[PDB]
Enzyme design. Structure first.
Site: not given
Ligand SMILES: Cc1cc2nc3c(=O)[nH]c(=O)nc-3n(C[C@H](O)[C@H](O)[C@H](O)COP(=O)(O)OP(=O)(O)OC[C@H]3O[C@@H](n4cnc5c(N)ncnc54)[C@H](O)[C@@H]3O)c2cc1C
Ligand SMILES: CCCCCCCCCCCCO[C@@H]1O[C@H](CO)[C@@H](O[C@H]2O[C@H](CO)[C@@H](O)[C@H](O)[C@H]2O)[C@H](O)[C@H]1O
Ligand SMILES: [S]
Ligand SMILES: [S]
Ligand SMILES: Cc1cc2nc3c(=O)[nH]c(=O)nc-3n(C[C@H](O)[C@H](O)[C@H](O)COP(=O)(O)OP(=O)(O)OC[C@H]3O[C@@H](n4cnc5c(N)ncnc54)[C@H](O)[C@@H]3O)c2cc1C
Ligand SMILES: CCCCCCCCCCCCO[C@@H]1O[C@H](CO)[C@@H](O[C@H]2O[C@H](CO)[C@@H](O)[C@H](O)[C@H]2O)[C@H](O)[C@H]1O
Ligand SMILES: CCCCCCCCCCC1=C(C)C(=O)C(OC)=C(OC)C1=O
Ligand SMILES: CCCCCCCCCCC1=C(C)C(=O)C(OC)=C(OC)C1=O
Ligand SMILES: [S]
Ligand SMILES: [S]
Ligand SMILES: [S]
Ligand SMILES: [S]
Lengths: 421, 421
Positions: A163, A359
């Site tokens: 992740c 994501c």
């Molecule tokens: C920081 C972070 C950012 C993320 N951002 C995104 C995103 O932008 N988009 C995306 O699609 N995904 C994202 N994810 C990935 C993902 O979707 C998540 O991690 C999501 O919460 C996973 O779903 P899950 O049901 O598998 O596990 P979880 O959400 O971790 O749920 C697991 C659960 O079961 C429980 N549990 C564990 N052991 C036991 C036990 N022995 N007995 C009873 N309960 C228990 C927990 O306490 C918990 O409630 C992110 C993950 C992290 C860590």
């Molecule tokens: C969700 C999973 C992804 C990983 C987590 C996040 C990563 C961190 C993000 C770093 C981005 C920083 O840098 C940024 O990127 C884009 C380049 O595409 C630039 O933006 C450029 O493309 C975008 C569109 O996509 C235009 O709207 C913009 O006019 C152009 O300059 C920004 O000017 C710059 O500031």
């Molecule tokens: S990711």
């Molecule tokens: S994610």
């Protein structure tokens, strides 16, 4: 019981909560649905990094589960399962009480494997975590302590991590917050350490121009970046890092002082699940078929991070592909459908569908997001987006998902693509 | 006739061909469906730029319509309508024969308004077109003549244009082909002239990093680019260009010699449609409601480029937003649904849904593509993609759409999103 199957959902996370609602909706009043989870509250995990930098608080992203599932006729037990006996079909809870099931759906998510890196546990040293709200709050506390006494910052992702997005997000919002407080110049060094073979590989061989965009991002914030790294230990407030080349040959070792750190850990399966004989691979992830059914036990299903998904590549330093929300929800949907089918004499045929990763990262005013599918190249969709609209989308989605978790799901959940109709 | 409505589809293009199939499918054997078009063949228009540089040929992208629609019980008349009498509901064909209708669905696409720029017509001078296969073949012929006697190249988009992607695509593949023939160095100047307020605005205020990516693209090929331009005339093998600033003030006039040129023209409605009293706006585009029904005549519907869509911005030099395939198909679907409803006593409620633009450009080994919706910012989706996978996607889609046009459509056409299930 016979004629009235009792279905238990283990874990009330992104997969488990929808699962409990969807199961009760599918089964109706003639079947008991019981949700069991280690915490009495749901948390929206994509928001944890913002908690970790103080931009959000617990009350924004977390709420008690009991009232919401119970009004839907779901039984709720706020206790960790410590043991699962798949032969007798008994779950032993932390308090010693035991719960029987006819069908079990495992949605226990990840065990955060800090033990892989001695000293890396958040309670052991300066390297914190933003994977959970408990950890994110602790990370923010340590962030404030950094503010009082500035020193080196180290953020990134351990070997075996899957992740990576949140590491980049956190580094960016930390850089951003530091400037906002007029404190960025007090930081002697700001380093990004990752197991990725290159910046923006993200455990999926990159997506769109993730490499170019993330590289530029870190450089703009004056963050020095190192790839192909593994951390061997955290000790005496120092991070010990080994860096290899493509062939696994050590090209340098580093010792980084850390005043404030955050490294995404590797995930394993939780001990109560891993501990079921013949259930999991060595990582502790449930071995399932395409219908989300356990390979060993016909009446055990699983969804979410808890399932095993085979790797399609191998990187110089081990990394994994993430399991993300849209695919998790397709697994939940399949599992619910197939448990119901079983209950009615049929083998359900529903599958997870096509592997994909989605994501969203919010940097404050602007977001970044990606979609990749399927897992192997060349893909059918491989897109990276950035901008204000992406920030607005994350905010809207969080608001929506939290509401749905309070109101209940039927439900072909992603009809949130009706923004088309 | 009464009890057995006769439905006529005017125009066998991207909207009209699917429309004829979908109409016959919806209505069945108790209703006559008649397709009328100026050409006896269908053409896949996104492939015309490749024809224009010799990378594709007519037989690859075009096929005779008659056999395919007729096996579906659709009547086919390969004749241009010259006049439409909406009071009597009679269409007068080029040969003098007249066809009556109970319902008319207009899918006549664009009139290429070369007359806006004196001398710009492809048969009048060196500035060619790749909007149709006839024009693309003529463009390629002129390209070969360039190869024999190299001179300045000028490619781009006129004032009032709404379809900008193909100009960028064509410039890129021309640059590419020139290098492949070892001829690129013989070209004295290569200029890109556009009415866009900036490179990559694309009539939609840009999408993703379209501005940065297209700017870099042209610069890499040594193509000199000028925005905020209108061409006042083509004469003596020279292009007369006026360039303004944001405020419309002329900042320079240029006179460009042209040995080989291609400028996307502005679109108007075709004369037989524009000529219907009270049917169209001054541009000759059919004024429709959200159900694709003409505002004036209850029994006239329309879909595709032929309909009027209000602008949401105004640029220093007039430009328009494109009308693209997925949205065209939603219009066709709505119109078919609502004509059937009418036939059964109801006002159909189906609409086009959300405005969106989708485009794909193939540069040979790699493609570019975008999705933007809705029309105004901030958008819900605003994404730009580039890569080999995009080239593969275009190739696959062309193959699919052509096959569907031969086999027939039912059909919620874009179930080609099943690549998910
Ligand atoms: C920081 C972070 C950012 C993320 N951002 C995104 C995103 O932008 N988009 C995306 O699609 N995904 C994202 N994810 C990935 C993902 O979707 C998540 O991690 C999501 O919460 C996973 O779903 P899950 O049901 O598998 O596990 P979880 O959400 O971790 O749920 C697991 C659960 O079961 C429980 N549990 C564990 N052991 C036991 C036990 N022995 N007995 C009873 N309960 C228990 C927990 O306490 C918990 O409630 C992110 C993950 C992290 C860590
Ligand atoms: C969700 C999973 C992804 C990983 C987590 C996040 C990563 C961190 C993000 C770093 C981005 C920083 O840098 C940024 O990127 C884009 C380049 O595409 C630039 O933006 C450029 O493309 C975008 C569109 O996509 C235009 O709207 C913009 O006019 C152009 O300059 C920004 O000017 C710059 O500031
Ligand atoms: S990711
Ligand atoms: S994610
Ligand atoms: C070069 C180019 C590239 C494009 N690339 C894309 C892309 O990648 N993706 C996308 O979604 N869109 C693309 N488009 C935009 C769009 O989708 C097309 O222009 C599409 O063909 C429009 O569909 P249509 O049914 O409205 O008009 P058309 O396809 O032009 O069909 C109109 C038809 O009706 C006919 N006709 C006109 N007058 C009469 C008359 N008086 N009597 C009888 N018949 C008549 C025509 O001969 C013709 O068959 C592209 C357009 C061009 C010009
Ligand atoms: C379909 C509508 C769009 C308009 C029509 C076509 C416009 C012409 C295309 C010009 C592109 C040329 O420039 C090209 O752009 C992308 C920048 O994102 C670069 O590619 C960069 O991002 C892509 C992913 O999107 C990565 O796979 C690649 O590794 C990276 O370098 C290419 O290295 C560069 O060669
Ligand atoms: C074309 C195939 C991919 C479809 C995905 C559509 C995007 C909708 C939101 C994505 C998302 C999901 C599913 C999601 O589950 C989630 O929480 C973990 C997010 O974080 C905010 C998301 O942004
Ligand atoms: C999320 C909302 C947008 C959905 C669009 C999905 C993309 C599928 C192919 C797009 C496409 C369409 C519709 C299309 O009609 C068309 O021909 C004009 C193309 O050219 C090859 C296309 O690439
Ligand atoms: S890779
Ligand atoms: S376009
Ligand atoms: S703009
Ligand atoms: S397009």
């Amino acid at each position: 019981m016979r004629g009235s199957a009792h279905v238990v959902i283990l874990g009330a996370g992104t997969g488990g909560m929808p699962a409990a609602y969807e199961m009760k909706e599918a089964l109706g009043s003639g079947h008991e649905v019981t949700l069991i989870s280690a915490n009495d509250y749901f948390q929206f995990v994509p928001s944890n990094p913002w908690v970790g930098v103080g931009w959000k608080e617990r009350d924004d992203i977390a709420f008690p589960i009991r009232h919401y599932v119970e009004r839907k006729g779901i039984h709720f037990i706020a206790q960790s399962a410590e043991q699962i006996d798949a032969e007798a079909q008994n779950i032993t809870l932390a308090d010693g009480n035991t719960v029987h099931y006819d069908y079990l759906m495992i949605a226990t998510g990840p065990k955060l494997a800090f033990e892989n890196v001695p000293g890396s546990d958040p309670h052991e040293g300066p390297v914190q975590s933003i994977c959970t709200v408990d950890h994110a709050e602790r990370a923010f506390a340590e962030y404030q302590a950094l503010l009082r006494e500035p020193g080196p910052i180290v953020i990134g992702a351990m070997a075996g991590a899957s992740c990576f997005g949140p590491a980049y997000e956190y580094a960016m919002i930390v850089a951003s917050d530091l400037k906002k407080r007029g404190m960025r110049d007090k930081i002697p060094s700001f380093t990004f350490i990752t197991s990725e073979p290159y910046i923006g590989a993200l455990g999926i061989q990159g997506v769109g121009d993730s490499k170019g965009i993330l590289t530029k991002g870190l450089k703009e914030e004056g963050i020095e970046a190192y790839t192909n790294c593994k951390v061997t230990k955290v000790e005496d407030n120092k991070m010990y890092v080994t860096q290899v080349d493509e062939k696994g040959e050590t090209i340098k070792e580093m010792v980084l002082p850390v005043k404030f750190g955050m490294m995404i850990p590797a995930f394993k399966g939780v001990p109560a699940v891993a501990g079921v004989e013949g259930l999991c691979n060595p990582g502790g992830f449930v071995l399932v078929d395409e219908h989300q059914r356990s390979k060993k036990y016909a009446n055990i299903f699983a969804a979410g991070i808890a399932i095993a998904i085979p790797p399609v590549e191998t990187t110089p330093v081990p990394t994994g592909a993430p399991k993300t929300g849209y695919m998790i929800e397709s697994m939940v949907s399949a599992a619910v459908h197939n448990i119901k089918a079983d209950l009615e004499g049929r083998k359900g045929e529903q599958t997870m569908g096509t592997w994909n990763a989605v994501c969203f990262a919010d940097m404050g005013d602007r977001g970044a997001a990606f979609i990749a599918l399927p897992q192997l190249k060349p893909r059918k969709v491989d897109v990276f987006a950035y901008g204000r609209w992406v920030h607005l989308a994350k905010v809207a989605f969080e608001k929506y998902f939290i509401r749905k978790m309070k109101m209940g799901v039927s439900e072909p959940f992603y009809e949130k693509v009706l923004f088309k109709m």
